[PDB]
Amino acid sequence: QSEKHLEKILNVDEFVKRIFSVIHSNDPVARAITLRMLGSLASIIPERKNAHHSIRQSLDSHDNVEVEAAVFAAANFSAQSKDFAVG
Amino acid sequence: AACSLIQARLPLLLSCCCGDDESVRKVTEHLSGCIQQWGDSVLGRRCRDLLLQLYLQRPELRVPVPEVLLHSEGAASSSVCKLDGLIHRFINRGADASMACRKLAVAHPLLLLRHLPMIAALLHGRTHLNFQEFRQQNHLSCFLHVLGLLELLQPHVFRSEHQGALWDCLLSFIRLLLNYRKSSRHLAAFINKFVQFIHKYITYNAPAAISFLQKHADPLHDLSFDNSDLVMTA
Amino acid sequence: SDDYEQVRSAAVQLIWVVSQLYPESIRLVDDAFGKICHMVSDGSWVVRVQAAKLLGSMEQVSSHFLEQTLDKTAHERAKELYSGAFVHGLEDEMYEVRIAAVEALCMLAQSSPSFAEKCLDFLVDMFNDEIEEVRLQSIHTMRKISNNITLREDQLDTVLAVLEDSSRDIREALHELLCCTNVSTKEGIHLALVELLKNLTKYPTDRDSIWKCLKFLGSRHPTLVLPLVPELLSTHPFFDTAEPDMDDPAYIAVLVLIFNAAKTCPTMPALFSDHTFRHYAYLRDSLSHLVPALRLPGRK
Amino acid sequence: TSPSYSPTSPSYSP
């Protein structure tokens, strides 16, 4: 909802660490939520290689509710970055 | 491309059997004919199958084809060889080092030939104690075990080109060891190395042809009766 | 021997130029080189610059006589423990002549494939010269003559220098040297690795060069590192090791070495643990100019 | 301990 206010964040690494720390959780729905949130943060972290990698990893799994979110996050980055779209 | 395709399709072959009887019944099947066999690759995948019978190695060795693919056994060979080298340098862990190594080496020749470069790159403690009197066994036991493995895997020496580079490297290291040793203080290893060189030359005149470049300096380097020996009961 | 300045200064140039034309006196270029050698200790400091530069430019000389410049030692004492023109030119009044000396030495070392091994100690010892220019020139010359050279025991000394205050130029030059040096002993690679890790943990600003030097140090000689694979990355035989952090710039540093070495040796993905595969995919996605494409099953 | 974070997983430092 509040996407316009995202750019005005002074502290980004701490925030992204906190958000990304729940992508290793074994819960297939907790991975899907986090991939959606990352997709919603392409504006402020469009070049993060670790995020790109994690999304490209989750894109080829067996859990439908997380594949259907990895697709969304991938479509989200593929607009605000290039070296992600090429892969 | 065919080999890569076989790699791509192999996992289903492994999973569909997942049984020793099935693997045996498969390996025992080799077709006749000599044109577009292609069975050599799948048979060599017996390395992945991690078999324990030398019978499979027999037809595979007869095929005598290069191996560059991933192999399941590759872990055990490195474990054993590195343990042998470390035990040699350490002077309880060495009981297996010298016995199980040769046992598995004779059980399967091709795996050790594939693993050769790693062991060849070892045994470079020659310069640490050139006399080797300072080194209790760090300069002797390792070479003894390795050369003995060579005399055991003469078929490995009998292996054709594309694998003799490691053999040449090991031979150059051995020649440097002979040159830099404590002036023939002990000659058991020297006799063993001379016998190994003679056997390699006899088995393949090509191995002699390549080794001549390095030996050019060696024949004048030794200038001793032992080297001249081959430089020319119940 | 004109016993006046500004005369010998160019007489040396004349003897060099005539000598280099053709070596036929009785030995002509060797005789002229001997004359330059006996002159290198000229009273002034202006002469010695030309003295050094010209003998450096010269390229052909009798081998046996060449080493007689360096022959005098604590260096051979150290070598046993583990097992004269330049001798004076290297340590002179002001750094100009030292720079000229190192340049001449690098030139003629390049020229002669031999005589290099004799000069490695004379180079390395002369690191703590206190003149940054001489520092840099010594590093550069060691790099330029780094080929078919071994540091059986010189590794630790040439690596001790890697810890400078900032000396960003010096430390970067040392990394450049390492990426083009040659070592022969496994313990040497292990040692270099551990000092590089200390470097990275103390100066977390040049990791971007640490990684490249490690990449080259792997590609240059892969087989040396294969014995280290079980030890360097913890792979407790029957325990599932906890995923080390993906982005830690010590784990990445030690992984890039392995992956670069892995292009050559086919057997080692067997040694690779569980994590290393997805971690390799992540690296090959992030830093595409450090890890080459491999044969791993995960990324076909 | 951590029923959803898995025993073999990178630990959150802070």
Describe the structure.
Chain D: This is DNA-directed RNA polymerase II subunit RPB1. Chain D: Belongs to the RNA polymerase beta' chain family. This is part of a larger assembly, with chains A (87 residues), B (234 residues), C (300 residues) and D (14 residues). Chain B contains 15 helices and no strands. Chain B has helices spanning 2-17, 20-27, 39-44, 46-49, 54-62, 74-90, 94-107, 109-121, 141-152, 154-158, 164-180, 188-203, 205-215, 217-222, 225-231. The termini of chain B are far apart. Chain C has helices spanning 8-21, 29-39, 46-57, 63-67, 74-82, 86-89, 95-111, 116-125, 132-145, 155-160, 168-180, 186-202, 207-220, 229-232, 251-261, 275-286. By secondary structure, chain C is an all-alpha fold. By secondary structure, chain D is mostly loops. The radius of gyration of chain D is 8 Å and the shape is globular. The B-C interface holds B 8, 68-72, 74-75, 77-78, 82, 85, 114-115, 117-118, 120-122, 124-125, 127-130 and C 82-83, 152, 184-186, 223-224, 226-227, 229-230, 265-271, 295, 297, 300.
Instruction: Calculate Rg of chain A over CA atoms.
Output: 12 Å
- Quote the beta fraction of chain C: under 5%
Helix content of chain C: 55-70%
Give the helix level of chain A as a range of percent. Answer: 55-70%
Number of helices of chain C: 16
Topology, number of strands of chain C: 0
Structural class of chain C: mainly alpha
What integer value in Å does the Rg of chain C equal? 24 Å
Number of DSSP strand runs of chain A: 0
The secondary structure category of chain A is mainly alpha
Question: Which two chains form the greatest contact, residue counts included?
Answer: B-C, 25 and 22 residues
Mind describing the biggest β-sheet of chain A? Answer: none
N-to-C SSE series of chain C? Answer: HHHHHHHHHHHHHHHH
Shape of chain A: globular
Oligomer: part of a larger assembly
In whole angstroms, the N-to-C terminal distance of chain A is 29 Å
Largest sheet of chain C: none
The H-and-E topology of chain A, N to C, reads as HHHHH
Strand content of chain A: under 5%
In one word, what is the shape of chain C? Answer: elongated
Contiguous helical run count of chain A: 5
HEAT repeats (chain C): 1-22, 27-62, 84-112, 113-151, 153-191
Subcellular location (chain C): Nucleus; Cytoplasm
Protein name (chain C): Integrator complex subunit 4
Function (chain C): Component of the integrator complex, a multiprotein complex that terminates RNA polymerase II (Pol II) transcription in the promoter-proximal region of genes.
